[PDB]
Design a protein around this ligand. Structure first.
Ligand SMILES: [Cl-]
Ligand SMILES: [Cl-]
Ligand SMILES: [Cl-]
Ligand SMILES: [Cl-]
Ligand SMILES: [Cl-]
Ligand SMILES: [Cl-]
Ligand SMILES: [Cl-]
Ligand SMILES: [Cl-]
Ligand SMILES: [Cl-]
Ligand SMILES: [Cl-]
Ligand SMILES: [Cl-]
Ligand SMILES: [Cl-]
Ligand SMILES: [Cl-]
Ligand SMILES: [Cl-]
Ligand SMILES: [Cl-]
Lengths: 519, 511
């Protein structure tokens, strides 16, 4: 008998010794951390009765990979399974509503987290189910990274999903064990050198895997597109370190004209793309410091030559600039704190910090509130009680889903979620209640629009929150133009004239950040 | 080392030696005469066409608005100035009168003749409308429709495979050396066009992309469709209030879907054709060779026989030798007795339910020409109805029973291509419309219609075909699609069978 022989495990003490030997543990969700009831007769007798007929149908694979959504999958299945779609939907909702944790295995996960193991979730789940599961259960915080088929356009047991996890997370397979109930997933993982642990009803099957042989994707294309985009952006900003911009009446800036007389794009690029060459940072920083419309560490959007009559300094440009200058050691907190105090003196009747340093131009904007809050927490103002109404404004904007209508100056919903994730992730103790609702919204928006900049925002925000969004990443590659830059995009607007501002530089900087953060 | 040629008589003997001739458009068939500007930015269009972004535009990845927007940034020229220059360039193009005559003669001598050219979609649409040599090509291979461009060897392989070219007897006329160089690598002889002469290289051919995956998907699709129709030869249908039939309920009580499939997908196995033909012949909604859309069990009270089901059924049976023209002609005469006061043939056999529909008129006209009624004078107004519907672009509003514009263009293409002498004036306006619509909607059945109709008109639409491939589900079927509606209640009918049958016809016709 040449077949390897799994060591049977029947005592939690044994399980703990085995698991303690490994640096990295990979969990499945289904029937390891969760269980559910699949049988649901309804008020409708026609058709199937067991949700297992749906999840094992080939169409379910398209759902799992994010190619189709649940409405679409159920339409196809109502035909193939000769069952009214409204019954299929009812069956699926009831099954989903009946899911619970596996108490032993969630406790296992919590303990491995305490012991500072590296823990990853690798699972086939469709996108809307994943959203729901993320909100409903509370073991996600135990994971160092979450790899879900609907965000990957891959599914177990395809070898490519194991290869992508191993590469994405830099896994050393020799000290990695994989817990799953399906034998064909475990066999696929062992052939990558990962040791296996079969989760059975009353036992565990433990197979140590010496491994050692090397590992068999998109990676060559990726390196050339990254290089081509870098070269494109570096040439643009070495030639024009004052970031150019075009104005038009549509988000694609079709027929836009060169404007190039506002400092905010430059600040945005400094603030967001973390791999700029040092010489470009210096030249762009110089444009910030020497900008026309700086008055006593307050910044105006416009160069003086372009400033409309009576156009005030604004808190969005000032917050983002002060925050960048402080992070790069060009200003001290003690110089910034008096300007922050003027921001706190800029609240309106509801207590919300406003957009302009000008009592005759009252406005609020939830992204401007976010970036003001970011600066506040950065300088030590984080517990000033005068911030409470501004934070609640931001919180309700998220929870109410009002952000789906955009803000006054930023129409795209993902921009709000993106700048929010900077605050929620960089100051986690002060923003815990934002973490899950924010991550849940982002999950539901994976691949929901085609604009490269929007794609890139979702990639970066989700990855900073522990979740790998490979789908938006792939489609982001498809839209690089042949000179290596991405298309222009209108990131913000003058709302009364409906003028969009944007640049190829802005799109390309975020696209490269997204490519970098998943590398 | 090329052989320099300056004798027309020689050229004629070189060209007579080849079965297959490939033309480029630039310099070979169209040349230009280059009007200044003191505005800021570039003066010659040469800088746009050599910019890497121009390649995206030629490959059909972006349109002209998009490319001009990027180019206006990289070239620091106002996009409106780039746009004006582009347009003046394209409109100053003129035919090459010698080559157009060479091409007319080769066509009249029965050669196989192809156009292989890098041109963006909107320019091609304009040039297709502007000039009248397109009719001498057997197949037009344009980069914006292929998502390939010269001189990459992929585009030559695609052409050789797509048109089944024997390179031994093929010669390529072009004026760029790198294009000819690449063609030679495939065994194709070259004729470099200069203004004073041709350089001719004879090259010995005759020696032997995504074909692996295409085959799997075609096999998977055929297996899905064959299983569905072996199990339900009365083609099923679902109904709902939206084109995707989200929320749709099984209906399967109308015969027209079965007729559409028999009529449109030409590779069904013999046994499925027989069972489905049996459903047509046994349909109880039938009365003296007129058909009703509904089974009797579902017929609404006083619902009449209609010319759309009847025309399509009679046409299919005549074509599959189940009925004779002599039995059909008295039904055709009843259709001619069904004109409204404007002289247009109506939808229903019932003077109390007066309706017209441009697709019903098309399928009636098709039957008429098939049976020898093609010159009856009573058809004149119905034909003018269809023509005005096309030319006026009113078809973009859909017809009464078919909301999707490509459905009208697709059924028109069958008529126009199957009876080419009676519909000449339709050919170019119809091909123009279809060209501007390449890749303009996501629905698979619509993609498929544009692919099939364009190929029948001699233009290879690979853009729509590649996107078609991505929407197949893992069981081999494409998603359900609402092909027609009961307009007063706004009910869509459709099936996965219909979507799948058309998608497979599209894959087959480009194979
Ligand atoms: Cl639970
Ligand atoms: Cl959690
Ligand atoms: Cl997969
Ligand atoms: Cl500059
Ligand atoms: Cl400090
Ligand atoms: Cl406001
Ligand atoms: Cl707002
Ligand atoms: Cl904190
Ligand atoms: Cl023509
Ligand atoms: Cl190329
Ligand atoms: Cl049947
Ligand atoms: Cl006959
Ligand atoms: Cl009518
Ligand atoms: Cl109509
Ligand atoms: Cl004819």
């Amino acid at each position: 008998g040449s077949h390897l022989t799994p060591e049977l495990i029947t005592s939690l003490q044994e399980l703990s010794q085995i698991l303690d030997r490994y640096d990295t543990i990979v969990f499945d969700l289904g029937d390891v951390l969760l269980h559910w009831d699949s049988v649901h007769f309804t008020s409708e007798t026609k058709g199937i009765d067991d949700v297992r007929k749906m999840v094992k149908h080939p169409v379910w694979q398209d759902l799992e990979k994010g190619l189709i959504n649940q409405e679409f999958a159920l339409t196809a299945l109502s035909c193939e399974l000769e069952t009214p779609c409204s019954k299929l939907k009812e069956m699926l909702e009831l099954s989903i509503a009946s899911l619970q944790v596996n108490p032993l295995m969630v406790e296992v996960l919590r303990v491995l987290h305490k012991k500072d193991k590296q823990i990853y979730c690798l699972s086939n789940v469709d996108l809307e189910s994943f959203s729901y599961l993320y909100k409903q259960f509370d073991f996600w915080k135990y994971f160092d990274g979450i790899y879900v088929s609907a965000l990957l356009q891959l599914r177990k047991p395809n070898p490519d999903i194991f290869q992508y996890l191993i590469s994405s997370a830099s896994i050393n397979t020799k000290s990695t064990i994989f817990i799953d109930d399906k034998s064909e997933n475990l066999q696929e993982a062992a052939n990558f050198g990962i040791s296996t642990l079969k989760y059975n009803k009353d036992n565990f099957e433990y197979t140590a895997i010496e491994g050692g042989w090397p590992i068999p994707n998109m990676t060559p294309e990726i390196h050339k597109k990254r290089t081509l985009g870098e070269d494109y952006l570096n040439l643009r900003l070495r030639k024009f370190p004052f970031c150019k911009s075009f104005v038009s009446n549509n988000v694609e800036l079709i027929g836009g004209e060169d404007f190039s007389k506002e400092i905010f794009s430059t600040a945005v690029i400094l603030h967001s793309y973390t791999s700029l060459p040092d010489d470009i940072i210096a030249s762009m920083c110089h444009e910030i410091l020497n900008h026309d419309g700086q008055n006593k560490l307050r910044w105006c959007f416009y160069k003086n030559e372009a400033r409309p009559d009576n156009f005030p300094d604004d808190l969005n440009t000032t917050s983002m600039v002060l925050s960048f200058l402080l992070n790069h050691n060009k200003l001290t907190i003690e110089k910034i704190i008096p300007v922050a105090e003027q921001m706190i003196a800029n609240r309106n009747e509801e207590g919300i910090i406003q957009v302009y340093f000008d009592d005759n131009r009252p406005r609020i904007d939830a992204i401007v509130a976010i970036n003001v809050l970011y600066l506040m927490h950065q300088i030590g103002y984080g517990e000033r009680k005068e911030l409470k109404e501004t934070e609640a404004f931001v919180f309700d904007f998220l929870i109410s889903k009002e952000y789906l209508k955009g803000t006054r100056y930023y129409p795209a919903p993902d921009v709000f979620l993106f700048f929010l994730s900077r605050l929620v992730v960089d100051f986690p103790d002060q923003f815990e209640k934002f973490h899950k609702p924010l991550t849940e919204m982002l999950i539901t928006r994976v691949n929901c629009s085609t604009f490269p900049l929007e794609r890139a925002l979702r990639i970066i925000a989700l990855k900073k929150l522990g979740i790998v969004n490979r789908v938006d990443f792939l489609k982001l590659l498809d839209t690089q133009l042949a000179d290596g830059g991405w298309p222009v995009y209108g990131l913000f607007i003058a709302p009364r004239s409906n003028t969009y501002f944007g640049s190829r530089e802005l799109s390309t900087a975020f696209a490269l950040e997204a490519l970098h953060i998943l590398s």
